[PDB]
Design a protein around this ligand. Structure first.
Ligand code: CL
Length: 236
């Protein structure tokens, strides 16, 4: 089986300065190699699932190694304590939202852990918990969710998005868009909440704010005929 040193060498060889620049622009810090996710497919196909190696890779603090650790993890064997370790190391949103939340969405304890995270009051843990719901609404049938719980979550986003921490706002906006398209029981309420919320401004260090517009984004998906569509998050 592939060892830690060999994976780290292969990932460093795939790093490109362009991809790296972008990751650093988004909040990654050294060490980081800048590996495009599709370039990971052959290494991931060799390894399949290996929790031990995922743990060593996540501990590097190297964003690309940490991303790859999520692809090779065994989330059905990870405990709540394991996910709390991983979220403690997720130092910016690409880790919280695209690595830990996606690994969590593939576990058997996703909603329980995401709910705790949403309740935590900590920017990136809450971002991971809202993000995990977006990934679950694309990889689960509707009957995996309580309609009243999702409705109460939409109301929480309406009532509190504009005074939430910046990265939390991005993930709650993603939740509005994802409920409107991928959770048809509350399609109409999500559309109306999006209209009530309006533009959501995500302030960012080192670049301009992002002005999100969930009403627009939902309308683009409706224009494409995607009401009801559920997309499993694509990792690589
Ligand atoms: Cl806002």
């Amino acid at each position: 089986s592939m060892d830690f040193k060999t994976v780290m060498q292969e990932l460093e060889a795939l790093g490109k300065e362009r991809t790296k620049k972008i990751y650093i622009s988004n909040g990654a810090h050294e060490p980081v190699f800048g590996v495009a996710t599709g370039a990971m497919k052959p290494i991931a196909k060799k390894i399949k699932l290996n929790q031990e190696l995922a743990e060593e890779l996540y501990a590097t603090g190297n964003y690309d190694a940490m991303y790859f650790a999520g692809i090779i993890a065994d989330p059905k064997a990870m405990s709540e304590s394991d996910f709390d370790r991983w979220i403690d190391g997720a130092y910016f949103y690409m880790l919280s939202d695209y690595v830990v939340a996606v690994t969590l969405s593939e576990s058997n304890i996703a909603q329980d852990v995401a709910d705790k995270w949403i309740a935590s009051g900590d920017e990136l843990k809450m971002s991971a918990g809202w993000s995990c719901y977006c990934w679950l609404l694309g990889n689960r049938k509707d009957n995996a969710f309580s309609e009243s719980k999702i409705s109460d979550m939409l109301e929480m986003v309406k009532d509190t998005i504009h005074h939430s921490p910046e990265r939390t706002k991005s993930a709650m906006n993603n939740f509005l868009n994802t409920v409107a398209i991928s959770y048809v029981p509350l399609h109409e309420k999500a559309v109306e909440i999006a209209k009530e919320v309006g533009i959501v401004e995500v302030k960012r260090d080192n670049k301009k704010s992002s002005l999100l517009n969930a009403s627009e984004s939902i309308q683009k998906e409706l224009d494409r005929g995607r009401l009801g569509f559920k997309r499993k998050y694509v990792r690589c």
